[PDB]
Write a structure and sequence with these properties.
Chain lengths: 82, 177, 114, 80
RNA sequence: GCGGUCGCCUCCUAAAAGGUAACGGAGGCGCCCAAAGGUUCCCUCAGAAUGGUUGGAAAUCAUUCGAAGAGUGUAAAGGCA
RNA sequence: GCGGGGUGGAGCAGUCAGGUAGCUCGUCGGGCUCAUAACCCGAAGGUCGUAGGUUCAAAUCCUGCCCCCGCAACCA
RNA sequence: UGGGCUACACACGUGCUACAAUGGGAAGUACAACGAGUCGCUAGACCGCGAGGUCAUGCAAAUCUCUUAAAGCUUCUCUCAGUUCGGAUUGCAGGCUGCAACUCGCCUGCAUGAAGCCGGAAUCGCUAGUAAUCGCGGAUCAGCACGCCGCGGUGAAUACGUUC
């Protein structure tokens, strides 16, 4: 996977936005196109609207979700069945 | 005799003090223990019932009574009087010995054991423990069992209230959740 | 026997150990190396003391219902959080990126000609 | 108690192999190994490895580490 | 004429003894049991509530309530705890 | 009211005489063919109308019930 | 910018790996050819179980390297087992390339160990260094092939005959 020396990855703009909202009593939805961003404890407790190709699907972060990419929690394509 | 000694010595004074009984006669005690093994597979093959009966007899030390369907039910392919399910009754010393072994040995051997329920009370001070599988009792030998099976162990006490029954069972040793 | 599983008798000790869940061939070699027991001897030929030493190593290891609970917990964790992988597990589809247009029979199950 | 119909029942002692907790109780199973006991008596001994005392739930303390948080996994992973 | 019926048992008709008709209203019988007979001893049900692995409305188990709401080979009436 | 029937998609056995669910066509899939047909190879499709009894066992015996078909429902 | 071309009740084509003992596994030992290499091929050493990492060496090359090829041969073990066959799927933990590996890369270790017991009707390639089988290099290419192109190793059976 992602090599250890490299650290995590998180788009700087997304990381900056979450850090700005850190000092907040109540969190506001963060609209992002950054599928690549990795989830952080700072991300915990927020609602992030991740772009899924055509619209920003909201996702509530939690300590269970940490350690994964945001895009994985926003399915791209819909398949109801046949 | 260990559990009987434990009861009479520790439990009886403790319950007397806790519940402020005027006379010692009021002390709740385990009247009997009825272990029931419900075998619906007997209809398909009576040998299933025979193996279940053999397992129960080995576990309990007494020959079980082979209960029979009081009614004929088409839903279960059941005809009235078919020998489905067995039970054993234990009182006094045998009751105490089996209860002590259940508390100590068999319960830990249960898969992913986190204790026993704390709500399986009829509302009159009588409890029942639903064993999901055998092989927890050392007498089973973990190998003879071709098909795994469960059972229901009903502990009947003289306790008037679920509270008194819970106290007695806990003192005798019961890993409630 | 060792971890509650009756490993084969006539087989060699390494292979009989592999029959335990949560233990592969490499792990079997490592535990036997720690215990000092030769890998060629059959489990029937193993002495009681060697068997007990093997038991201590295995107990130190994590296997059987413990490992099964752990893996099920991980899979359940994915499904509950609603990950893409969790939905893959829920719908019985390849989770590691394979293509589902063909193949995928291992996850999907037997073919339905409909 | 009826005769010749009940499974052979005998007193037997159990010892927790891990902790050594002892208790005497009846059983259908018999053990070739026999041990002494207070009151100057001997009974077959059925050794057991797991008992109430050994089992974690009765103790109230858990042997498992309870797993790790994912961020903590990541902390150890990338030294962060 | 056609259809239905022809002997025996039970109920209602039947008018609180008995009996009482109609091509009046309803059902059964042409057996069964070697125990489903006799006797001695012993026992009490159906359902419900609650708790309990398979097990689900409902299999078997336990406490309580529960005078019959069951059962009585076989129709109904009468009777039987 | 008198009969005849309810089994796979359709048509039919099996029912009498209790043990085990079939034949034909048809359908789905794959072959052959330039392609279709014919042909060849696989597969599916009913718990036997339905509910109760009899039995160790019911598609089969018994009872009722629901459906569909034909006839009748009045004569000098 | 992000997503899709990577979907997935299904049908077909083309391949790879298998179903095992003419084999799996462990150790030792032998023999190639075609090609590629500048911020590229990388020696040697050290670290790491491994993928690889660090230091560092030679070579714009019949000079150094990729590159001691694998089948093979010799021992030891396995004893016909859905297994010490099989290597899918899955969990974990990692190595790389890249700004970035969730959709959606390759690879490594541990763990798990799926179907599969030689395949119906039918159907394909091949007449000799060929079929079969074993590796190796290359173009594309930051990274990524069971594909394609090329190279060599070992190396058969059969052809009566032209009715169909
Ligand atoms: K895919
Ligand atoms: K395909
Ligand atoms: K095609
Ligand atoms: K291929
Ligand atoms: K070999
Ligand atoms: K990717
Ligand atoms: K490449
Ligand atoms: Mg294993
Ligand atoms: Mg892919
Ligand atoms: Mg009168
Ligand atoms: Mg009168
Ligand atoms: Mg009578
Ligand atoms: Mg674009
Ligand atoms: Mg494409
Ligand atoms: Mg084989
Ligand atoms: Mg030619």
């Amino acid at each position: 996977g992602r090599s250890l020396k490299k650290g995590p990855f998180v788009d700087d703009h997304l990381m900056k936005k979450v850090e700005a909202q850190q000092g907040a009593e109540k969190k506001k939805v963060i609209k992002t196109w950054s599928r690549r961003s990795t989830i952080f404890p700072s991300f915990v407790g927020f609602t992030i609207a991740v772009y899924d190709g055509r619209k920003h699907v909201p996702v509530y972060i939690q300590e269970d979700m940490v350690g994964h990419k945001l895009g994985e929690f926003a399915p791209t394509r819909t398949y109801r069945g046949h | 005799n260990r559990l009987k000694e434990k009861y009479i010595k520790e439990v009886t004074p403790s319950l007397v003090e806790k519940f402020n009984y005027s006379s010692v006669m009021q002390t709740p005690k385990v009247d009997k223990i009825v272990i029931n093994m419900g075998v619906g597979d007997a209809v398909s093959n009576a040998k299933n019932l025979d193996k279940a009966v053999e397992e129960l007899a080995l576990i309990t030390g007494q020959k079980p009574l082979i209960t029979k369907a009081k009614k004929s039910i088409a839903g279960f392919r059941l005809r009235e009087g078919m020998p489905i399910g067995a039970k054993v009754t234990l009182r006094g010393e045998r009751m105490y010995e089996f209860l002590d072994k259940l508390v100590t040995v068999s319960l830990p051997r249960v898969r992913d054991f986190h204790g026993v329920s704390k709500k399986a009370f009829d509302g009159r001070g009588n409890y029942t423990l639903g064993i999901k599988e055998q092989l927890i009792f050392p007498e089973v030998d973990y190998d003879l069992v071709d098909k795994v099976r469960g059972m229901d162990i009903v502990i009947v006490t003289t306790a008037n209230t679920d509270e008194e029954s819970r106290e007695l069972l806990a003192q005798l040793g019961m890993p409630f959740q | 026997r060792i971890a509650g599983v009756d490993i084969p008798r006539d087989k060699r000790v390494v292979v009989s150990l592999t029959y335990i869940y949560g233990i592969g061939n490499t792990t079997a070699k490592k535990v036997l190396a720690n215990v000092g027991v030769s890998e060629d001897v059959r489990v029937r030929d193993l002495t009681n003391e060697q068997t007990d030493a093997i038991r201590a190593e295995i107990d130190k290891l994590k296997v059987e219902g413990d490992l099964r609970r752990e893996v099920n917990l991980n899979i359940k964790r994915l499904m509950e959080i609603g990950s893409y992988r969790g939905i893959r597990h829920r719908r019985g589809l390849p989770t590691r990126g394979q293509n589902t247009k063909n193949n995928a029979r291992t996850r999907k199950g037997p073919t339905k000609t409909v | 108690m009826k005769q010749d119909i009940h499974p052979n029942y005998q007193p037997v002692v159990f010892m927790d192999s891990t902790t050594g907790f002892k208790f005497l109780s009846g059983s259908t199973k018999g053990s070739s190994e026999t041990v002494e006991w207070e009151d100057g008596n001997t009974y077959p001994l059925l050794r057991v490895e797991v008992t109430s005392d050994s089992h974690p739930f009765y103790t109230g303390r858990q042997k498992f580490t309870q797993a790790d948080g994912r961020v903590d996994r990541f902390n150890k992973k990338y030294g962060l």
